[PDB]
């Protein structure tokens, strides 16, 4: 009953069977957007996903293993990370666009709509033309988003006497399972050890400017409530708040 | 903390 | 001439002798620590290593193949995520304190002294904890700081035309070296290929670590900065100002 | 941006 106990196979198929529903953005929408209305669009859609990657993270292997202290920080940390990561691999078949859900589909220059929005629509654009240029795969997306969850908020828990340690060391153990199974998959692609190495770098340095997207983001996000433009859902509220904390 | 801590506990 | 055809001890090599001086903090300063007097004193330090980075970066195997736009944004990029690595890793023989200097070990709570700093100090100290867990080497330490360098602003350039591409290529290429460079340090040192590709991830996945710690310590420098607290030379004024242009 | 495009330009 152990993720550490799991085949890359099993891993693969666990990440896979773990994914959230698909959700479509609120209906029929006027035109054209206004900063309020793209704002409320867009945070109604993220804290509907929020919802949903509640029960995805407890099916992601090793997760239900923590404290439920430790399950709140982790998601806490890598909320937005993981979001952007969804927005960034829907975006991959879409050039110059993003793809929020499959009925709102925002260019660059809609981005503009949002003061300060363009910047961050175009960090998530590079990344994912880097995806593309990549030939990101399903399987190893899923194994990316899960290292994301496991690993955002990793160095920042207290130091919660030994119960800490053992947590700690537990999500690194899971952690180097999703390293083997990402090299498994680069392996049975027919990559070689070379180049297994290089691509496993590759995608975990992506990682990095996932999280400098994610504190802008949060910066972003934290201006827009300030300015009174948006309302929130408390779960949405929670996990900015948790950046503020 | 609430909210986030008890939809976890849940099933 | 090239850094792409650099064995793996000729890069551990050209890194190692690009290293910069050592610096000691100014001599003697008053007792006890005020707000003012420690921010001086940690921003006089990293404006003198700012001095030393620009030299040390047109020796990391190449940077000077990059055009000077590009030399720029790397290092407007990478800065702080470089000065902190460094930190971190002169911290490890410290257990809960910093060693900024020779001459200025800090502890958790002398970063009291600034409003907002013990939080930072905290993720500092984590981060060289987990290198100390880790027993990382000096060669693994000179690979990670060059990734730095080349990857924390690879994603934010412009689209500069085909040079622009060209750019990017060359970069992501260099990284590949150090990848192997990595492997075979851990190759070297024993370890098996599931153990070389783990290692690999958990030093990288360290990276996002130190990038979320710069975005912090960047929102802090501006806060100490706007506060008028703090009197800053132009380099370490143009470093931060890149992250509000 | 004069500063370290200046800097990085000499030897
Ligand atoms: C958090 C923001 C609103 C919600 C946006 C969203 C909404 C849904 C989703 O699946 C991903 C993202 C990524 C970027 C987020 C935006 C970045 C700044 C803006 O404030
Ligand atoms: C940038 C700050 C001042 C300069 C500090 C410094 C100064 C010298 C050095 O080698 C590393 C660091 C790391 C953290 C930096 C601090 C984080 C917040 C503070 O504002």
Same mark, same amino acid.
Not at chain 1, 12 to 29: K, N, T
Not at chain 1, 136 to 153: A, P, R
């Given at each position: 009953?152990?993720?550490?106990?799991?085949?890359?196979?099993?891993?693969?198929?666990?990440?896979?069977?773990?994914?959230?529903?698909? #959700?479509?953005?609120?209906?029929?929408?006027?035109?054209?957007?206004?900063?309020?209305?793209?704002?409320? #669009?867009?945070?109604? %859609?993220?804290?509907?996903?929020?919802?949903?990657?509640?029960?995805?993270?407890?099916?992601?292997?090793?997760?239900?293993?923590?404290?439920? &202290?430790?399950?709140?920080?982790?998601?806490?940390?890598?909320?937005?990370?993981?979001?952007?990561?969804?927005?960034?691999?829907?975006?991959?078949? &879409?050039?110059?666009?993003?793809?929020?859900?499959?009925?709102?589909?925002?260019?660059?220059?809609?981005? *503009?709509?949002?003061?300060?929005?363009?910047?961050?629509?175009?960090?998530?654009?590079?990344?994912?033309?880097?995806?593309?240029?990549?030939?990101?795969?399903?399987?190893?997306?899923?194994?990316?988003?899960?290292?994301?969850? #496991?690993?955002?908020?990793?160095?920042?828990?207290?130091?919660?006497?030994?119960?800490?340690?053992?947590?700690?060391?537990?999500? &690194?153990?899971?952690?180097?399972?999703?390293?083997?199974?990402?090299?498994?998959?680069?392996?049975?692609?027919? %990559?070689?050890?070379? +180049?297994?190495?290089?691509?496993?770098?590759? #995608?975990?340095?992506?990682?990095?400017?996932?999280?400098?997207?994610?504190? *802008?983001?949060?910066?972003?996000?934290?201006?827009?409530?300030? *300015?009174?433009?948006?309302?929130?859902?408390?779960?949405?509220?929670?996990?900015?708040?948790?950046?503020?904390? | 903390? *609430? %909210?986030? &801590?008890?939809?976890? +506990?849940?099933?």
């Amino acid at each position: 009953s152990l993720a550490l106990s799991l085949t890359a196979d099993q891993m693969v198929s666990a990440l896979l069977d773990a994914e959230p529903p698909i #959700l479509y953005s609120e209906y029929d929408p006027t035109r054209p957007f206004s900063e309020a209305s793209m704002m409320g #669009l867009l945070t109604n %859609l993220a804290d509907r996903e929020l919802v949903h990657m509640i029960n995805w993270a407890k099916r992601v292997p090793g997760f239900v293993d923590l404290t439920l &202290h430790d399950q709140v920080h982790l998601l806490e940390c890598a909320w937005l990370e993981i979001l952007m990561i969804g927005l960034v691999w829907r975006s991959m078949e &879409h050039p110059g666009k993003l793809l929020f859900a499959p009925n709102l589909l925002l260019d660059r220059n809609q981005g *503009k709509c949002v003061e300060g929005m363009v910047e961050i629509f175009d960090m998530l654009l590079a990344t994912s033309s880097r995806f593309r240029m990549m030939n990101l795969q399903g399987e190893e997306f899923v194994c990316l988003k899960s290292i994301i969850l #496991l690993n955002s908020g990793v160095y920042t828990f207290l130091s919660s006497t030994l119960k800490s340690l053992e947590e700690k060391d537990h999500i &690194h153990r899971v952690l180097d399972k999703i390293t083997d199974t990402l090299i498994h998959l680069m392996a049975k692609a027919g %990559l070689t050890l070379q +180049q297994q190495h290089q691509r496993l770098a590759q #995608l975990l340095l992506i990682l990095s400017h996932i999280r400098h997207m994610s504190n *802008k983001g949060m910066e972003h996000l934290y201006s827009m409530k300030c *300015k009174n433009v948006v309302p929130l859902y408390d779960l949405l509220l929670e996990m900015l708040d948790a950046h503020r904390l | 903390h *609430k %909210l986030l &801590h008890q939809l976890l +506990q849940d099933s």
